[PDB]
Design a protein around this ligand. Structure first.
Ligand SMILES: Cc1ncsc1-c1ccc([C@H](C)NC(=O)[C@@H]2C[C@@H](O)CN2C(=O)[C@@H](c2cc(O[C@@H](C)CN3CC[C@@H](N4CCN5c6cc(-c7ccccc7O)nnc6NC[C@H]5C4)C3)no2)C(C)C)cc1
Ligand SMILES: [Cl-]
Lengths: 149, 104, 89, 120
């Protein structure tokens, strides 16, 4: 099972608009489903970029690869532009769970080597070491999108 | 324009939102439904300033930008016991421990 | 309708039932083990932040509004994690 | 450019083999596997290809070499076809669609060459 860009050959102009407080990494899923990193967007920035109909994008925190949303969902697929308007890709923070947000902050303050020196239940060591990761999310998203044909 | 508040008396803290258009009196009514003390037995404060019943929260200096869900604005609450109101008292939250070694 | 969450240091936090039911743990504590819950191991500097998280969650879930970062001071981050793990939220 | 003509049956076998290889379709999806290999991308489009692959070749070039009698045997042809597939395998990752297509095309060439040599 593979989530991947379609080689439509049909240009599509997109605005990547960063409406999050994070440095945003655009991630392009190539024709074999392999994630490819694109130049980053500082918070409060947008860029007009050239893509293709049926190409697949996701967006992460450039530093941690924490998940971000695009037009309120995890995946962005440009369609055909109408009347010379680019498609807007609005990149926003999810509402993280409190636990995930706490894991982000602790991960930001503590080296992976030192996770196990923290005074917490063992199951939280495992939660810390389960780092946000694009490949692991693609496996989940691939399963989710079966139903979306 | 919603403002997000903590109404605080002693060791009591109420989390609620109100409209910037809503009044101090309407807030006392919210407090009355929760803590079973009528508005005439309450004083509400923004910092050290006693708030007037007829004032909107907007006019008291609460704004959506300074009263956020993740960072609510504090309203102090003092009750009338018998003849007179207590001195406004808000007990502080506990202190966090020293940053552990691995977090510095 | 409001529920009361009480810290280990005896601070009483009154929040909307709806906000508190953000936690599956609190949902269960309310349905057996009044409209009040004691946390013997969650101090007021942690539980106040949990209540603020409930407010934030309910406000920004399914909202088009730009979502701000939920802020956590380094000094509370370990205890807040332990509370979030227990409360499952 | 154009070398002295091969005997007609040799040329006919070379054309029948490369034709069958080009036409070959995935049995289940019906996708013609050769499509990407017909013409090399531009130096412009894929400059890394030319820095990484010393002797580029595509099916359009292979047909040109049949027509112009650059191959003097099925072995000469086979070497160019295996070089095309080996180049695809050098440039692309094991498990990529183009890598795996090139593996299948090697074994299609071999199978077709055997079927066509047998044919008297
Ligand atoms: C500034 C900024 N800030 C924040 S973000 C950002 C930004 C945003 C965008 C860009 C730039 C301008 N835009 C992009 O990068 C966009 C984005 C996303 O949509 C992908 N994409 C692209 O451009 C890909 C792309 C190109 C393409 O064109 C097809 C019509 C056709 N191509 C498909 C893949 C090729 N294949 C050609 C044979 N090739 C092989 C051939 C052989 C071979 C052949 C014959 C014989 C023997 C052989 O071995 N072998 N191997 C091959 N391997 C690969 C294959 C590739 C043709 N469609 O999408 C680009 C990146 C690929 C910039 C900044
Ligand atoms: Cl990546």
């Amino acid at each position: 099972p593979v989530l991947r860009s379609v080689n439509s050959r049909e240009p599509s102009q997109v605005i990547f608009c960063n409406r999050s407080p994070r440095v945003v990494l655009p991630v392009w899923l190539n024709f074999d489903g392999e994630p490819q990193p694109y130049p980053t967007l500082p918070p409060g920035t947008g860029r007009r970029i050239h893509s293709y109909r049926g190409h697949l994008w996701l967006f992460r925190d450039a530093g941690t690869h924490d998940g971000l949303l695009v037009n309120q969902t995890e995946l962005f697929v440009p369609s055909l532009n109408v009347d010379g308007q680019p498609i807007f890709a609005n990149i926003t923070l999810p509402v993280y769970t409190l636990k995930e947000r706490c894991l982000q902050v602790v991960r930001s303050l503590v080296k992976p080597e030192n996770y196990r020196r923290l005074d917490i239940v063992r199951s939280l060591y495992e939660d810390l070491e389960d780092h946000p990761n694009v490949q692991k999310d693609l496996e989940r998203l691939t399963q989710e999108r079966i139903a979306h044909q | 324009m919603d403002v997000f508040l903590m109404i605080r008396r002693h060791k009591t803290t109420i989390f609620t939102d109100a409209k910037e258009s809503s009044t101090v009196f309407e807030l006392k009514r919210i407090v009355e439904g929760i803590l079973k003390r009528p508005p005439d037995e309450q004083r509400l404060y923004k910092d050290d300033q006693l708030l007037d019943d007829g004032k909107t929260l907007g006019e008291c200096g609460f704004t959506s930008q300074t009263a956020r869900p993740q960072a609510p604005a504090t309203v102090g609450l003092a009750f009338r016991a018998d003849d007179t109101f207590e001195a406004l008292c808000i007990e502080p939250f506990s202190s966090p421990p020293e940053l552990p070694d691995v977090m510095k | 309708m409001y529920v009361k969450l009480i810290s280990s240091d005896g601070h009483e936090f009154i929040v909307k039932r709806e906000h508190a039911l953000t936690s599956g743990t609190i949902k269960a504590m309310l349905s057996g083990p009044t409209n009040e819950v004691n946390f013997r191991e969650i101090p007021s500097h942690v539980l106040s932040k949990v209540c603020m998280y409930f407010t934030y969650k309910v406000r920004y879930t399914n909202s088009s509004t730009e979502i701000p970062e939920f802020p956590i001071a380094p000094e509370i981050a370990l205890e807040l994690l332990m509370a979030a793990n227990f409360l499952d939220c | 450019e154009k070398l002295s003509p091969n005997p007609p049956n040799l040329t006919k076998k070379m054309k029948k083999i490369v034709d069958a290889v080009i036409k070959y379709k995935d049995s289940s999806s019906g996708r013609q596997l050769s499509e990407v290999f017909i013409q090399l991308p531009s130096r412009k489009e894929l400059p890394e290809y030319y820095e990484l692959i010393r002797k580029p070749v595509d099916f359009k070039k292979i047909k040109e070499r049949i027509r112009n009698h650059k191959y003097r045997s099925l072995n000469d042809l086979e070497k160019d076809v295996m070089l095309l597939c080996q180049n695809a395998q050098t440039f692309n990752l094991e498990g990529s669609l183009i890598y795996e297509d090139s593996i299948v095309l090697q074994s299609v060439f071999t199978s077709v060459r055997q079927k066509i040599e047998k044919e008297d």
